[PDB]
Amino acid sequence: DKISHKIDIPDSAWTIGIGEKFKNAGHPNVKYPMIDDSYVQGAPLGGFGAGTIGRTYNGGFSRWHLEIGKNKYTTVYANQFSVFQKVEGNKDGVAQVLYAGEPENGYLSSWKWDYPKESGMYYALYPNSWYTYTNKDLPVQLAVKQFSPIIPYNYKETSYPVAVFKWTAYNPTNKNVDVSIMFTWQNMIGFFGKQVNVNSGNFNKIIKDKSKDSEIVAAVMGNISNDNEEWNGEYSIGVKKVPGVDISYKAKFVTTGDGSDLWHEFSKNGILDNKDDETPTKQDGIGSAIAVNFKLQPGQTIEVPFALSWDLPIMKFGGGDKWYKMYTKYFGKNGKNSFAILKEALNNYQKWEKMIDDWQKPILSNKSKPDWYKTALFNELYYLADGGTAWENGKVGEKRTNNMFGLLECFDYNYYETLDVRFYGSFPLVMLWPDIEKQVMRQFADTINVQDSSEFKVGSNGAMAVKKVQGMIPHDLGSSYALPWIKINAYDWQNPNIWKDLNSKYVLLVYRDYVLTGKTDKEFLKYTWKSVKTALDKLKEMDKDNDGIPDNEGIPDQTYNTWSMKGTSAYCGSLWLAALKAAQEIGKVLKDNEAYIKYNEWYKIAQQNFEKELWNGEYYNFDTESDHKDSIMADQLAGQWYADILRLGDILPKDHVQKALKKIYEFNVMKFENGKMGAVNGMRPDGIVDESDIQAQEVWTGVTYALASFMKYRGMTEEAYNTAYGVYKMTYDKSGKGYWFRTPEAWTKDGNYRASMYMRPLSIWSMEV
Numbered sequence: 225d226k227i228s229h230k231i232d233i234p235d236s237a238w239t240i241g242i243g244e245k246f247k248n249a250g251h252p253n254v255k256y257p258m259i260d261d262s263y264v265q266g267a268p269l270g271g272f273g274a275g276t277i278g279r280t281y282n283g284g285f286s287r288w289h290l291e292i293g294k295n296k297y298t299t300v301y302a303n304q305f306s307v308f309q310k311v312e313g314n315k316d317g318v319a320q321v322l323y324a325g326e327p328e329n330g331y332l333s334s335w336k337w338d339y340p341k342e343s344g345m346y347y348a349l350y351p352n353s354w355y356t357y358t359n360k361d362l363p364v365q366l367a368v369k370q371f372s373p374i375i376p377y378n379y380k381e382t383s384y385p386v387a388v389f390k391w392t393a394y395n396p397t398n399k400n401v402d403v404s405i406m407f408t409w410q411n412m413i414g415f416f417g418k419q420v421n422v423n424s425g426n427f428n429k430i431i432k433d434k435s436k437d438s439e440i441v442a443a444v445m446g447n448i449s450n451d452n453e454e455w456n457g458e459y460s461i462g463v464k465k466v467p468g469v470d471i472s473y474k475a476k477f478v479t480t481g482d483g484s485d486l487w488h489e490f491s492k493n494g495i496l497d498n499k500d501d502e503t504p505t506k507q508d509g510i511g512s513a514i515a516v517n518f519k520l521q522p523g524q525t526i527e528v529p530f531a532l533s534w535d536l537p538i539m540k541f542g543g544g545d546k547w548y549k550m551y552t553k554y555f556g557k558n559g560k561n562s563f564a565i566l567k568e569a570l571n572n573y574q575k576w577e578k579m580i581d582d583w584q585k586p587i588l589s590n591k592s593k594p595d596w597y598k599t600a601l602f603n604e605l606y607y608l609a610d611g612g613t614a615w616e617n618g619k620v621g622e623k624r625t626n627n628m629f630g631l632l633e634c635f636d637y638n639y640y641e642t643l644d645v646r647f648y649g650s651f652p653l654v655m656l657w658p659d660i661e662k663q664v665m666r667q668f669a670d671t672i673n674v675q676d677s678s679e680f681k682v683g684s685n686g687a688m689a690v691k692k693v694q695g696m697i698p699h700d701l702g703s704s705y706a707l708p709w710i711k712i713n714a715y716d717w718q719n720p721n722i723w724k725d726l727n728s729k730y731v732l733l734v735y736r737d738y739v740l741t742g743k744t745d746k747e748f749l750k751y752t753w754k755s756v757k758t759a760l761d762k763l764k765e766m767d768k769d770n771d772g773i774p775d776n777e778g779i780p781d782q783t784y785n786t787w788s789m790k791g792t793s794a795y796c797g798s799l800w801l802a803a804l805k806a807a808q809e810i811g812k813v814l815k816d817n818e819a820y821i822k823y824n825e826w827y828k829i830a831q832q833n834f835e836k837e838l839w840n841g842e843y844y845n846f847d848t849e850s851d852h853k854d855s856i857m858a859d860q861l862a863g864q865w866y867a868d869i870l871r872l873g874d875i876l877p878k879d880h881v882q883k884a885l886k887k888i889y890e891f892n893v894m895k896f897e898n899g900k901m902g903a904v905n906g907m908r909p910d911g912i913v914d915e916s917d918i919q920a921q922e923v924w925t926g927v928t929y930a931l932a933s934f935m936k937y938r939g940m941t942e943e944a945y946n947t948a949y950g951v952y953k954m955t956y957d958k959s960g961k962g963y964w965f966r967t968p969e970a971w972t973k974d975g976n977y978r979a980s981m982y983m984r985p986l987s988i989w990s991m992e993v
């Protein structure tokens with residue numbers, strides 16, 4: 225490896241060998257069908273709300289999130305980079321697709337597949353990833369840096385459906401070598417959203433944009449239809465000329481054939497035919513190719529940028545609604561703008577690289593933090609783009625000031641903005657994209673007094689319930705299978721209108737968003753204040769026994785949706801206490817004296833009773849009425865965790881909080897698989913895991929990262945990082961279970977998982993507060 229020195233990969237990048245087999249991989253541990261796309265994954269490309277594309281460490285474009293809200297894992301084999309090399313003096317060169325695999329059927333059989341093992345590495349530090357190619361049959365060593373411009377405090381480039389591929393080529397040998405790099409791409413119009421004739425009308429055109437000191441050559445892969453539908457739009461690939469390189473292209477090769485129309489050209493001398501052909505296809509799949517060819521002298525380096533864009537302006541959800549995607553604000557809505565997007569990327573990628581470096585640098589440069597922590601911190605952010613992210617710029621045929629936003633819980637449970645989970649998962653948004661965060665919270669505020677008396681069948685018990693009760697915060701803002709932002713509470717397995725954590729978490733999120741954006745946004749507090757008061761007042765009505773605390777009902781009525789709490793729980797009770805303290809503080813800011821007094825009174829009573837009912841001398845009991853009420857819950861003091869972040873002070877005594885956290889580390893971490901796998905949710909006082917429900921026996925990745933942040937704030941530095949390390953290890957390390965770029969909600973002691981690609985572990989960003 226002589227190419228790594230010519231590029232700048234951070235030491236904290238996650239690494240794996242190209243073509244590496246992973247032996248230890250985990251699988252779903254539930255009885256029902258669950259997504260398992262394997263460990264062959266990578267950092268995604270694509271902006272927020274753009275649709276994303278997962279290019280794996282093997283080189284394939286395989287995890288397709290272009291249909292917003294859907295996860296489709298299939299390798300589109302025509303989508304590749306390939307290389308040709310010929311040493312000056314040899315009669316023949318060699319050509320190789322840079323993919324560690326081959327197609328399953330006979331399409332593209334002419335291409336040179338099966339990039340060999342032990343011949344290159346993949347690196348990732350989201351939003352960047354890299355591949356290096358160090359192959360005994362490729363005298364010129366190559367690397368590529370690939371990324372999309374995901375930039376904190378930037379709502380423009382961050383939305384773009386674009387990727388850059390910045391290639392570096394170096395000749396360490398003593399002979400001249402002719403080199404070509406070729407990008408192939410299938411015209412994927414009709415890959416989704418088209419019910420018949422999936423390739424019909426697809427056609428490819430070549431754009432040559434020549435001006436002074438700029439030449440861009442691109443293929444635009446579109447359809448003859450000017451219809452405005454979810455399926456229609458354009459893909460583009462292309463390259464920017466640099467000194468010493470020539471560009472060639474092929475506008476149309478058949479992807480549903482043996483590929484030799486293209487490959488006979490590329491494998492000869494790495495130069496394509498420059499054949500334009502705008503003939504639309506009927507049944508055949510078609511694709512385009514863009515190549516560069518150059519001669520490298522001994523010791524010479526060259527850099528050349530390629531790019532990929534996709535202009536698919538309309539997202540459709542299963543309930544029938546069609547919306548424009550965010551990026552259309554910047555490029556238009558007609559679906560004929562892929563070249564414009566590509567050109568912007570090819571002309572500005574160096575600036576974008578520096579913007580990414582500028583935001584990553586303060587963390588990367590902090591030599592007090594271990595590299596493993598940085599690996600997880602940055603790479604967990606993959607989910608902000610890969611979580612079915614929806615970000616609208618108008619309903620098709622409808623303009624508003626704001627752009628509604630939603631992130632999925634996960635794909636197995638297809639619910640946008642599950643608030644009980646976003647309590648943990650939304651940290652990166654408040655810290656790095658606060659205008660999105662505040663928009664989402666205003667969406668929730670607007671739902672508070674919505675009443676929908678239509679009934680639904682509650683899946684767990686068969687009872688009928690009102691869809692949405694006035695004064696109750698919704699569990700979620702809909703499903704991609706139905707009507708995001710329009711039909712809320714798509715979750716129907718239980719009734720969200722009786723949950724005991726939604727209303728408190730809502731208030732805590734509101735106050736969090738004020739505090740972590742500088743305690744200056746009074747307008748945000750004003751917008752949300754009525755909903756905050758309503759939320760707390762409604763929750764107070766669920767106190768059955770007049771102890772001042774809402775009662776859990778002995779069935780699941782909070783985020784641990786199969787683990788029943790009864791009476792006063794540490795979890796919901798502590799959240800309630802913190803939410804009351806937050807509302808007091810908002811009351812002071814807004815000069816609402818009567819609210820301040822009321823919530824102060826409720827707080828003092830509830831605090832006294834919480835302590836009496838639950839403090840046992842060592843920790844806070846799980847609850848007051850369950851069979852295993854004395855279990856040690858990892859998340860028992862979630863309200864105090866948020867109170868620390870919100871600078872609300874001690875809601876419980878410092879000594880008792882310290883004792884409880886030490887107990888949790890000693891038991892839930894250190895007595896669970898030697899503290900190498902995170903914090904198990906429930907442990908009995910005898911040091912055996914609580915077996916009352918599956919969720920008690922699970923480590924929740926997002927709960928564990930949040931607990932690590934709580935320990936860190938309380939000065940338990942070693943315990944904090946040791947706790948978080950188990951989650952990092954399981955996700956990323958060779959000794960783990962292979963969950964990189966698909967961090968699950970949970971695993972059990974065997975390492976097997978539930979719900980890959982999960983919102984909650986974004987909570988690792990609470991460790992940066």
Ligand SMILES: O=[N+]([O-])c1ccc(O[C@@H]2O[C@H](CO)[C@@H](O)[C@H](O)[C@H]2F)c([N+](=O)[O-])c1
Nearest residue numbers: 477478479480481482483484485486488489
């Ligand atoms: O000059 N050539 O080497 C060559 C070879 C195959 C060619 O055509 C190829 O034929 C294969 C066998 O029917 C099909 O599977 C491919 O789809 C087609 F590209 C072409 N061509 O039509 O461009 C040229």
Ligand SMILES: O=[N+]([O-])c1ccc(O[C@@H]2O[C@H](CO)[C@@H](O)[C@H](O)[C@H]2F)c([N+](=O)[O-])c1
Nearest residue numbers: 628667668670671674701708709710711712
């Ligand atoms: O998920 N959301 O973004 C969202 C927002 C407002 C929503 O609700 C809307 O709220 C407005 C302001 O409170 C009211 O004027 C409308 O009557 C109501 F439809 C809903 N919803 O009714 O399901 C959902």
Ligand SMILES: [Ca+2]
Nearest residue numbers: 767768771773
């Ligand atoms: Ca009570």
